Design a protein around this ligand. Structure first.
Ligand code: NA
Ligand code: NA
Ligand code: NA
Lengths: 502, 502, 505
DNA sequence: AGAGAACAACAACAA
DNA sequence: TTGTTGTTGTTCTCTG
DNA sequence: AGAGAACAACAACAA
DNA sequence: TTGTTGTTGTTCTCTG
DNA sequence: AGAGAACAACAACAA
DNA sequence: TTGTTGTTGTTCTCTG
DNA sequence: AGAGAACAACAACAA
DNA sequence: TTGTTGTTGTTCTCTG
């Protein structure tokens, strides 16, 4: 168990041999740091010791095609393996899922990505169930539901109703999930607020285009190279696109007013009211933070939506110096937050905020329906159908306090609920909604099940996107022949190893 | 940092050399396992490496008299050193202390032991301030207070009033602390209940004496040696003296009815109603658990007194088969619990129970005075006279919830109190009163100070006793010349190293 | 790795840390300051320096340092090993008719086990061996002669000694023990005898009862009245079990007399001492002071002692010489001490005793009927050990001196009688440093067959002291805390320690 | 309790 | 397999 | 004796 | 001079 | 967010 | 001191 | 060419 | 026979 440190003369040969790998094989330096590579390097030492330095490597080392093959099989195995856990989760109501469509760019195969999210032990699960080619089949509602239904079969989940689905507003997909629980991606929602808000504030158009072109120039004119940080362009498809850009100009201002002057093109930047830029950036900076909190799956997020909404509305509160132009923007963002975001929220959203100990907030009418919803929801999950030395010091002094049985029927729904409402949790820096319910699991038997249930619903389809992101790094320019089956396998295996092994 | 494992040939010589130490020096085998010996063995390796295997040991190794001298000085140093912490503690009201008188048995010097107890960080402090010879000075109230006052000066604590003293009922001592906060040792109290209860239940006398003599015989007749476990005698000065004995007979019954029969003295055991014994043992077993919980200083205890009282009263509840004799006993224990224990409790006691989350219990009149006490107590302690990425996710979404300032004046005493009362903590196996207040420190600013303040008051003078116990292992038959100054030093140093170093 | 006599000194900066680290040990672990002066500790510290140099400071001490149980285990092992090892040297000495032993029963105070201590003494080179062979339990067997013998027989097998007859056993007068040795060589403990004499004596002199008790109560008082703390030395009490009990107590009062008359007066209790005849006190401790010395001479095991028995007896009788101003009381005391010395001590010595005095160079003394018997004995003992053309043809002597008929005798040595007789003709001047042992070792040449017999007697201890001492030792192993240590471990811990003292430098 | 101590009958391991 | 070590958990001890 | 222990009051030093 | 060490010699403890 | 990758300017260390 | 390593924290990239 | 990649459908094996 | 491996040869990718 005492890990042996080797000779510096060996360590020296180690370096050389690895570098050469990276060179001869065109691998990234980070290749050696990969955790999975370490473990394999370990097994090759565990062979060298138990077989001696004269092995027939070439025979020992599997051929690519077997690796691909082990993967595809290994896939079916583990998919099958957790078939139960997932199956339980789904049925006991703690399942949440996100789906989106994506397309590679070599064969242009059209895919459906599906992610599952649930609460186990003290952790929140971030699972990729699969990336299935919709084949070359139109890409209609029906066909989506089908492949959706299909991806779940692999785990042996056949009743999809108890699943809370988080998806963007893609006409096709929303219709596919027309008969199930479907929550609107608040990320996509926010971005819609952002896009419409700007569009209806043409007053801002100029300095944006102005800025747009300060980049366009720098790129074209090949002087980006001296900024320390590049001027980031647009790429409108991305979230908080404007922000990232203005911020790039702002972050570099000095260095740029200067190079445009001495290279005599101050014509470019002089019409740009820097204050307006500075200001839009502040407004927008918060959106960036909200944009990020809503894309997290390693912690609950749905609870943060209503507060994100409160944050926008605060940011957009009219302050005193408010330049005429900014102020119009603010009123617009606000107006859109209501007619676009708020309007597309659901009961889930509100409840989830409610499940965040500092509860005082939605007193208004919301508490009412919230309860009623909670009740309806908890009833459904009620269809789960030597002496005195070695005895707990608690049990010893307060025996009437521990009592009898595994089940605790007396404390009812309405009582647990109204019990919650009495709570008073002080907000602490580190506080974690997830822990706090797992603590009060005891005091809140059936309610805590509901809470961790909502608290696991992702706040947006980020999850799905991220998948496609990933699939991308495997369906590469050179790796282009990789097959659907193979891909889904690779993706799944990688998700699994993360969610299921330490 | 990679600890080198040595040659088995060295490890072999290690053994030999150590054994010889134990033999040649008449040391206990456990001598090598002592943590303090390890650390010194480490420093002798750190010398061997940095000076080589040819050192003049004999000169290097200090003479006893310097060791004694370093100790006595080292003493004054650290005593001085924590002078502040203790001083604070005392003043900010979180100080608790226990004192008792004791006498060695070589010079027959008469001592005063003093222990301090307080709450720091997440820990509870078990401190020996000192063992001072009262000299050969009568041992009157005055002289005690004096040496008491004196022991505190060493730390520079001159105002003793804010100190909550836990002591037995020794006429002299109780008078010495006549003007301070003095709480009655509940251990001593319990034992008084036990002793008087038995005495007033002469019906039990016979089988006890019977039993007493079954030991007396076995000891005298030298057949104890074959029991597996000895028959434990009386030693009345000890707590739960009867119990430990009956239990010894009971635990061995078979093996003894048998040896008394085959060695023809069944006359001895035949008059002993075994059931009565069995029963007294059960009654008494709980007392044993209560006896132990009340002697703990590494966790709060005062909170367990009232519940210990509830436990006795439960144990003594009349059950059905109750033999006439047992039943009288039960009624007596009960009667004494009131006129001896309950009667000698104080407000502290009740409050401390109250400071144990499952609070429902003392609803009756007690809550009233408890509050009033708590208030009075808290008023006294009121005489202590890149942007938006690197900002707490809590602070970001709920800023009105974190607010402004270090101090929180709005939430007042009565509000904090009535705030507590609303709490509902479910009792869990592992639950710890100390943690729970340190958690709610936030929500309960001034109250939590009060709570951890009481929660640190030892429930009995156990602490002091234990000290004398210790002092004993230093003022040994051979070590008899050891001096007062030296002793107190040794004791203190050892307390310190425990409370102040990991 | 065998040299370099110049030893390095350390920086007073490291001397400053060893100081710290050692105190901490003593504090943290609760050991006495004297722990570090220990010889064994030192030899061990050395070995840990030798480890750090040969391995570097970053060693895994925990792994290294053996567990306590591993140590106990070794000790029981090492015991068994060395006990077997010396098995020869001992087997020898016993057979070479020059080994003696002690025996006594002792009982511990935790488990209250009942033990049998056995000490062996003999002479090898210019030294006397004082050795503990064992402390075995009688288990819980009655404690009869049969068992004592059996266990005694048994402790000896451990060294492969199966024949005990040739051993000289000195034992007290325990009803039990004397019977177990009924068929062997048993010499009575002179120390126990002396205490016997002392006790009967005082008892048969009630006259002193009063002043003694009187004194006893002055201590009793000083203790109960917490006054002890003010004299230079504490008043001492009786503890009747102890030897020369009364003396140690009287002496304490005497040495502190002033200090106490003063105290008692200023506390209106002068009623306490006023009846104590200081003169008698004085006198008694003077008589008694001698007994102390005799007592202590009788408990030595490093120098011969059996020879000093007779001289001690002579000394007591000399101290009880009626002198002139002798107070009737004291006088009566003396007469009684003498009476008992004759009927208790002298009455229980045996030939071994006499002979052993005789082997002390200044040999003049028991010229008495004693010498006739002594030779007779020495002859028998030296036998046991033997079981391991005219001008030319006529002696140069028978020609030069014919009228010297004498022939049978043989002056320069030859046989036992001659060696004995040539001993007699000696004249050794008793100088201050004279070591009877050294002298016989030198004249081993001069006296071949006699020096053996002599050194053989001279190694027999004068009393049971060694055995008592053993128990005292056993006492420090079977501590309140260290209670639970089993026979095995104890016998080992004890033996090894003795072995290491007697067989190493 | 909370301190020091030994050991029987374990269970972990190196050879 | 077989010994050697170090683990466990029980049994003492002491202050009342 | 022959074992273990601490310490007041030394006497020796290094600084 | 001054403080720090180690030295001596006395006072305890135990077996009886 | 949550994934892979390189590196400048560090700070830790062995010689 | 002087090099060699491995650390940090910033800068890219991608999915929307 | 001259580089990286995955894979359907082979052909070779060990069992 | 039967499954598991490694083989071939074709289909992609990129510089232009
Ligand atoms: Na291969
Ligand atoms: Na030294
Ligand atoms: Na070890």
């Amino acid at each position: 168990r005492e890990l042996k440190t080797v000779s510096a003369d060996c360590k020296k040969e180690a370096i050389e041999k690895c570098a050469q790998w990276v060179v001869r094989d065109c691998r990234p330096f980070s290749a050696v740091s990969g955790s999975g590579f370490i473990d394999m390097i370990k097994f090759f030492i565990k062979v060298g010791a138990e077989y001696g330095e004269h092995v027939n490597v070439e025979e020992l080392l599997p051929s690519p095609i077997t690796l691909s093959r082990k993967v595809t099989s290994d896939a079916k195995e583990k998919k099958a393996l957790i078939g139960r856990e997932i199956k339980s989760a789904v049925e006991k109501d703690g399942a949440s899922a996100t789906i989106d469509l994506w397309t590679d760019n070599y064969i242009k195969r059209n895919f459906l990505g599906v992610t599952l999210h649930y609460h186990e032990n003290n952790e929140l699960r971030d699972l990729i169930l699969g990336l299935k080619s919709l084949d070359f089949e139109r890409s209609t509602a029906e066909n989506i539901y089908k492949k959706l239904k299909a991806i779940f079969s692999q785990f042996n989940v056949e009743d999809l109703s108890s699943i809370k689905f988080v998806t963007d507003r893609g006409a096709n997909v929303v219709k596919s999930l027309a008969n199930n629980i479907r929550i609107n991606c608040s990320s996509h929602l926010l971005s819609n607020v952002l896009e419409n808000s700007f569009e209806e504030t043409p007053e801002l158009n100029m300095p944006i285009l102005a800025c747009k072109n300060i980049v366009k120039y720098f790129k074209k004119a090949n002087l980006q190279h001296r900024l320390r940080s590049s001027l980031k362009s647009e790429c409108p498809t991305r979230w908080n696109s404007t922000y990232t850009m203005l911020r790039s100009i702002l972050d570099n201002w000095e260095s740029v007013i200067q190079i445009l002057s001495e290279a005599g093109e101050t014509q470019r930047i002089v019409h740009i009211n820097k204050s307006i830029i500075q200001t839009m950036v502040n407004i927008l900076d918060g959106f960036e933070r909200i944009f990020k909190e809503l894309q997290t799956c390693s912690s609950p997020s749905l609870c943060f939506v209503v507060p994100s909404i409160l944050k926008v509305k605060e940011i957009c509160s009219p302050d005193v110096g408010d330049v005429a132009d900014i102020a119009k923007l603010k009123v617009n963002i606000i107006k859109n937050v209501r007619i676009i975001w708020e309007e597309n929220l659901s009961i889930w959203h509100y409840t989830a905020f409610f499940f965040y100990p500092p509860a005082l907030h939605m007193q208004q009418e919301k508490v009412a329906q919230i309860k009623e919803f909670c009740l309806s929801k908890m009833e459904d999950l009620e269809l789960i159908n030597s002496h005195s030395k070695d005895i707990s010091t608690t049990s010893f002094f307060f025996p009437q306090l521990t009592q009898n049985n595994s089940r605790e029927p007396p404390v009812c729904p309405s009582d647990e609920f109204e019990f919650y409402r009495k709570e008073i949790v002080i907000l602490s820096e580190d506080f974690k909604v997830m822990e706090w319910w797992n603590l009060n699991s005891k005091k809140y038997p059936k309610l805590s099940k509901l809470a961790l249930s909502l608290l696991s619903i992702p706040a947006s389809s980020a999850a799905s996107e991220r998948t496609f992101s990933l699939a991308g790094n495997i369906i590469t320019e050179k790796r282009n022949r990789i097959g659907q089956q193979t891909v889904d396998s690779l993706l799944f295996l990688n998700s699994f190893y993360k969610n299921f092994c330490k």
